[PDB]
Design goal:
This protein is mainly beta. It has no helices and 5 strands. It has one domain: SH3 type barrels, CATH 2.30.30.
Amino acid sequence: GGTGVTLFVALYDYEAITEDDLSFHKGEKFQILNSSEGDWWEARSLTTGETGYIPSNYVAPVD
């Protein structure tokens, strides 16, 4: 299957409060690195290259 290769885009801005979490703008895209451990996914920003956690309800599949 093709589950892991789905890319996601932020629907909303988010401002992180800890160094391990990513800040992002609406419209920025992500590769998801780990999504098996709750509401927060580990992700790679396709805009900045930074990796960290993001609140998964802020993002949606790109298409």
